Amino acid sequence: LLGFGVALASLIEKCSKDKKDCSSYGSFSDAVLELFKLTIGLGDLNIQQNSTYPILFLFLLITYVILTFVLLLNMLIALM
Amino acid sequence: LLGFGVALASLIEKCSKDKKDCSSYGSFSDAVLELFKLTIGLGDLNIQQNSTYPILFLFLLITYVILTFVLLLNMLIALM
Numbered sequence: 211l212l213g214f215g216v217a218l219a220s221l222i223e224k225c226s227k228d229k230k231d232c233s234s235y236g237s238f239s240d241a242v243l244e245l246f247k248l249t250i251g252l253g254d255l256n257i258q259q260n261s262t263y264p265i266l267f268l269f270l271l272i273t274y275v276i277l278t279f280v281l282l283l284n285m286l287i288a289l290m
Numbered sequence: 291l292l293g294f295g296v297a298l299a300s301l302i303e304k305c306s307k308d309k310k311d312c313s314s315y316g317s318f319s320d321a322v323l324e325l326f327k328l329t330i331g332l333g334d335l336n337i338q339q340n341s342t343y344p345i346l347f348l349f350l351l352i353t354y355v356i357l358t359f360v361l362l363l364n365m366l367i368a369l370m
């Protein structure tokens with residue numbers, strides 16, 4: 211959560227032309243909150259960020275989904 | 291559900307300056323409904339409440355998520 215939170219957050223450029231737009235993954239704690247809400251399954255996944263690399267953003271975000279929604283949570287049920 | 295419902299609800303101060311704003315966790319039954327919808331996975335988690343302690347609010351809300359979304363539901367699948 212914290213590794214991909216800081217990576218995704220540091221990938222986003224300046225806030226906006228008006229300081230508040232599509233800055234979901236703006237800072238660290240805001241990106242950590244967005245990833246937490248993808249694990250719970252709440253909200254709406256929005257990839258149209260003010261990002262310099264949309265492909266690298268999708269790669270890190272989909273890797274996070276594969277590592278937690280698929281591997282870690284189902285492996286928790288199996289070990290339990 | 292009811293323990294954290296009444297705790298989170300009693301943490302929120304007066305309704306608003308207009309009696310209706312960001313009062314998701316306003317009263318008891320409204321906070322119980324919001325927690326129920328986090329368990330089902332519906333809605334959108336909004337922590338920007340008219341709260342006096344945003345940190346204590348996150349602590350109680352994340353503890354609820356750890357106790358039900360992680361422990362209790364997966365342990366239900368294991369015992370079943």
Ligand SMILES: CCCCCCCC/C=C/CCCCCCCC(=O)O[C@@H](COC(=O)CCCCCCCCCCCCCCC)COP(=O)([O-])OCC[N+](C)(C)C
Binds near residue numbers: 240
């Ligand atoms: C499958 C999942 C399982 C669960 C996984 C959970 C993983 C964790 C997920 C956590 C991510 C949640 C979001 C964090 C960031 C939100 C923003 C925020 O509030 O920032 C603040 C910090 O806020 C905190 O420090 C959050 C509260 C404490 C940490 C969380 C609980 C710790 C775990 C408890 C466990 C208890 C266990 C039981 C114990 C008996 C900082 O804000 P600021 O920079 O000061 O703002 C300045 C500007 N402003 C003042 C105008 C605003």
Ligand SMILES: CCCCCCCC/C=C/CCCCCCCC(=O)O[C@@H](COC(=O)CCCCCCCCCCCCCCC)COP(=O)([O-])OCC[N+](C)(C)C
Binds near residue numbers: 326329
């Ligand atoms: C993983 C999860 C699993 C499920 C967990 C579920 C846990 C439970 C979750 C419950 C939380 C749901 C929300 C409750 C509060 C909503 C608000 C509300 O209506 O308030 C009202 C009460 O409302 C009730 O009393 C709700 C209905 C009855 C209880 C729920 C069903 C009982 C379980 C059945 C089981 C059957 C089993 C099978 C039997 C064969 C009160 O409103 P008011 O104060 O009078 O309003 C005044 C102002 N106004 C009139 C203008 C409005």
Ligand SMILES: CCCCCCCCCCCC(=O)OC[C@H](COP(=O)(O)OCC[N+](C)(C)C)OC(=O)CCCCCCCCCCC
Binds near residue numbers: 212216238239
């Ligand atoms: C054990 C606890 C588990 C639960 C999670 C608790 C922490 C949640 C996030 C809190 C953030 C906060 O509040 O501060 C985080 C602070 C400052 O944040 P900021 O950049 O000013 O953004 C604030 C944005 N606002 C104003 C909108 C709120 O440091 C940082 O940004 C540094 C980030 C890089 C260092 C950390 C990397 C960690 C890697 C993994 C190590 C294991």
Ligand SMILES: CCCCCCCCCCCC(=O)OC[C@H](COP(=O)(O)OCC[N+](C)(C)C)OC(=O)CCCCCCCCCCC
Binds near residue numbers: 292293317320322
């Ligand atoms: C066994 C049944 C399971 C399913 C759940 C059923 C109940 C759901 C909620 C109904 C609420 C309601 O309707 O009344 C709850 C009432 C009055 O509510 P109010 O504060 O006026 O808010 C009404 C808000 N409105 C107007 C928007 C609807 O008491 C209370 O607030 C007292 C709360 C503290 C005492 C109870 C604590 C319980 C702790 C756990 C014990 C095991």
